Structures are given as C-alpha cells and as structure tokens.
Symmetry: C6
Subunit: 63 residues, 6 copies
Amino acid sequence: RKVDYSTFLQEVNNDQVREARINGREINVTKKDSNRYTTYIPVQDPKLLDNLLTKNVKVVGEP
Amino acid sequence: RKVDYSTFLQEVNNDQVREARINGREINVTKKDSNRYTTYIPVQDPKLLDNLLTKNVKVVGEP
Amino acid sequence: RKVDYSTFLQEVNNDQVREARINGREINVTKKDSNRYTTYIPVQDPKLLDNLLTKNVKVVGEP
Amino acid sequence: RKVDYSTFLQEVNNDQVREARINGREINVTKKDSNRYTTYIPVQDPKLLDNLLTKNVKVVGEP
Amino acid sequence: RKVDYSTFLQEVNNDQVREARINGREINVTKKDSNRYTTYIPVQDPKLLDNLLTKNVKVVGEP
Amino acid sequence: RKVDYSTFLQEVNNDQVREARINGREINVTKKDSNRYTTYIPVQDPKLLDNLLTKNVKVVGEP
C-alpha cells in the first residue's frame, strides 16, 4: 500500500508513527496500530530525520 | 501542458493547487479545479517542500 | 552571446531581467529590453532561485 | 550485530560510545564497554558529526 | 602558476583580484595587476560565491 | 601514518596545524612541528573549511 509523503509527515507529527525503514527515497512505515505502508521522499528533506527523532520514531537504514 | 516554475509557485501561493506529483525535477500538478499541467524544477529548491506543505498541497513522490 | 554570472546577478537585481531559462548550470536570459544571452552558474548558488523570484523574474526549467 | 540509527544516537547521547567508524552510511561502533555493533545512516545527517564531536566520540573515516 | 586556496581568499579579501574563472574546482584567477594564476577549491565552499561578489570580483563559469 | 578525524580537528583548533592538503575526503596534514600524517573526512563537513581558515591553516586542494 502506498501513502502520500505529506500524509506520512502528518502521521509522524500526529504521533501515529512507530518505525520508519528508509531505503534511499523509499520509506517503509509502521504505524502504532501496526498498519504498514510505503511512502517516497519527493525531494531532499533536511528536516526529515530531526522530525522523526523528535517524535520518538524508530529510525532504521538499510545496507 | 507546461507551466513555468515561478508561475507554478504563484499558484501554490494562491491555493489553486491540490496535488503535486514530483518525479525528479518534473512536477505533475493537479489544480483544485481538477486541471492538469507539468512544471519543471529549474534548480534545487530547498524551500519547495516547505512551501507545498505550508499550503496543504498533497505531495507525492514516484519510485 | 555570453555574459559573466556576476554581471547577470547585477542585472537581475537592477530589475533588468525578464526571464531565465535554466538548463543545468546554463541560464538562458532575456532582458526587459528583449536582449538575449547565455550565462553559466559557476558554483552551486542556493540563493539564486529566491533572488530570481524576489525580483519577479520569469523562471523556467528544462526537461 | 545491527542497531537502529535512532537508538545509536540515543547511546551517543548517553555517552556509551567510544568510537564511530564511518564508512559511507555504515558506521561501525565501539561502546565504552568495548562492545561492537553496526548501524546505518538512513539519510544524510548534517548534525551527525557535530553530535559525535560534542560527546567526545572518536570519529574515523575509511579510504 | 599554482596558488593555495587560503592565500587566494586572502587576496580576494585584499581586493587584488579582478576576475575568477571557475571550472569545477579549478579557478583561473586574474589579478588587478593583470597577473595570472590557478587555484583549486579544496572542498565545497558555499561562501565562495558570496565572497567573490562582495569584493566585486568578476565571476564566470565555463560550459 | 593515520590519525582520527576528531583528533585532527582537535589539533586544528589547538593551533597545532600548519597545512592541510585536501584530496577528496583525504586530508594530508602537516603539523607546526613538521610531523606529517593522513586523515579522512568521515562525512560531509560544511564547517571544515571555515575552521581551517579561522585558525590560519594553509589550505590546498588538488587537481
């Protein structure tokens, strides 16, 4: 399932996000209700990481 | 249809924009009146995402 | 015809610039007096886009 | 052993980190208790270096 | 002739520089006394352009 | 001989550094006591150049 980046950030800051598996521009997201989806980073977002960390999201990268 | 980046940002600032499908420098735009056009990012714009999000534009990226 | 980047920015902020067709580092410029020339971005300039937009320059990118 | 980036930064902030061997996005980490693990940088983090240095972490890069 | 980047910036700051022909990391420099030399950008310098422009240096890029 | 980046910066700001020959991520360092070594930039460091220049370090780049 695919979700819009803006919606994803909305969920991040609405404290609904548990984990974010970032793979290049691809982010595999797990919600706090265990729902899983994939979203893509549209353009370089320097504010992304700090946003995830400030909202206590589990952040993971891939080989 | 193709539209200039500056004009596109103007429309973003006048809330005529519903969605922005960003694919590299190519942005496929859908207006609130359901109209379609294409604009290109001229140079890297760090303020782009912030602008789209502040104006509640649905932002989506592509694989 | 080719013009120095510094001169180009001078013209941009002296309100003499109508349009800027950016193609990578290549900028195709049209003056308000319809004179046309080409200038090149020497190094990455994060202040460029905002400068063009603040001076109401038509900004266009290429495929 | 592999550890999540956010958790890794948490440990950096709790001074449990002695060394950080950065190799691209791969960081080989040695804790103050001599423990070893690997973490990956999820997206470009401009605050990473500053964070490591503020917490007196030995930072090393590889050829 | 080759000159160190720091020294080059010093000359820029002492207004001994007339032109700076930037070609990637290579800068071909012409002093106000018509003298020629070459300097290389050591790492990406976001302050370079701003420095050249503040000191009224003619800045040019190459295809 | 190879030295940790953090240690290198420590030396830079302890005014022990005379010259820095940067070659990509590779920095060839000469101390004020004529000792020479090689260190590597671990991740992009935007604060590096300004740091070297503020501490009056000879900064040189390579072709």
